[PDB]
Ligand binder design. Structure first.
Ligand SMILES: CCNC(=O)Nc1cc(C)on1
Ligand SMILES: CCNC(=O)Nc1cc(C)on1
Lengths: 204, 204
């Protein structure tokens, strides 16, 4: 009776792990497709399953990081959203912190995404008229040539500067979607999705 | 590409259906064991998965009703909780409405649970000093001998009446747990639980 309760709890943890991978895959897919409402509802389902999980494997932690990363990128223009205990950290700064924590390859795409997030973390502050906040995000991020141009743009209050059009929010989203495509191909073979795809195929 | 999106959405619906049955089973188990915190977190996970489901089978609707029923029974003493658009309906009245809607056998246990919920819907109002609310719940529920004693108890403001000890809140919970045991045996063979149990067993 006591050992049965233990086996049940172990079975619940296995199922929660399969649910986390499936929800990450659905979240990645909605982000790639720009299905905003499906992304919001999938994010709510992922947050709840995560609260029901205790011990995490390195793989499950990377899966959660990916979910948290896309959540912050989707809210990158919502400066009112507080993702950290320190209320001064903006959503793109929180996404940058997670991007540098994921156990992943630091290839060319990784650094390009990192640098696009840094430029946009400042740019979103400038477009909202938050010039003093843009300087504060700058000090938190850069602590030379790229750094020098950004400080010049902040001091000139050049909200719609041409530099922000070359390294745009759209460009950041497109590069992030390329990475999301790689995560989609890696997680398409997870237990729940494979089994659900086989039922659908068998009905055709 | 368009047909692939359709097949993916169909696979997501199959997986959401398997997740709903698993979460109902975990919710039933936590309610039976009195694991209050596990019940709260499982209820949050079940509500999110339900919002991601559109077309529902008669079986999936009964599964949701069961989840909603246990949620209202668990909050039966929280008179501040509003489970209906009409703010006057108390949690036990909302549980009674769902109990009479489930496509299930109306056996002796069914009517005993129904009658225990009616007595307790009034009793919880009396114990909180809400005597006028107790009369209003009475009018909503009974619209003779059982009805007559209850009206007499309400008019006498007999909060700790002996009748409420014979047909107690504990007695209602115990009878509801007997029904929950039947739901547990029926849903233990659902896809996610069976597959998760087999992985646990194979590791022993
Ligand atoms: C800081 C509170 N918000 C979040 O952590 N959001 C998340 C996390 C995951 C996962 O998805 N949204
Ligand atoms: C009225 C809003 N609250 C609920 O419907 N609660 C539920 C529903 C399910 C399922 O679990 N809790």
């Amino acid at each position: 009776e006591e050992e049965d309760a233990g086996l049940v709890a172990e079975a619940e943890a296995v199922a929660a792990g399969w649910m986390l991978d499936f929800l990450c895959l659905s979240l990645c897919r909605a982000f790639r497709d720009g299905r905003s409402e499906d992304f919001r509802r999938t994010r709510n389902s992922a947050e709840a399953i995560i609260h029901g999980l205790s011990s995490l494997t390195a793989c499950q932690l990377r899966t959660i990081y990916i979910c948290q990363f896309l959540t912050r990128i989707a809210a990158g223009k919502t400066l009112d959203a507080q993702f950290e205990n320190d209320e001064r950290i903006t959503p793109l700064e929180s996404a940058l912190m997670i991007w540098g924590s994921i156990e992943k390859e630091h290839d060319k795409l990784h650094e390009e995404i990192q640098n696009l997030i840094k430029i946009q973390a400042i740019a979103v502050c400038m477009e909202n008229g938050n010039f003093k906040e843009a300087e504060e995000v700058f000090e938190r991020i850069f602590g030379m040539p790229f750094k020098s141009k950004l400080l010049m743009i902040i001091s000139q209050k050049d909200t719609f500067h041409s530099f922000f059009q070359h390294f745009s929010y759209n460009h950041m989203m497109e590069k992030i979607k390329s990475y999301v495509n790689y995560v989609l191909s890696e997680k398409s073979s997870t237990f729940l999705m494979k089994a659900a795809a086989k039922v659908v195929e068998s009905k055709r």
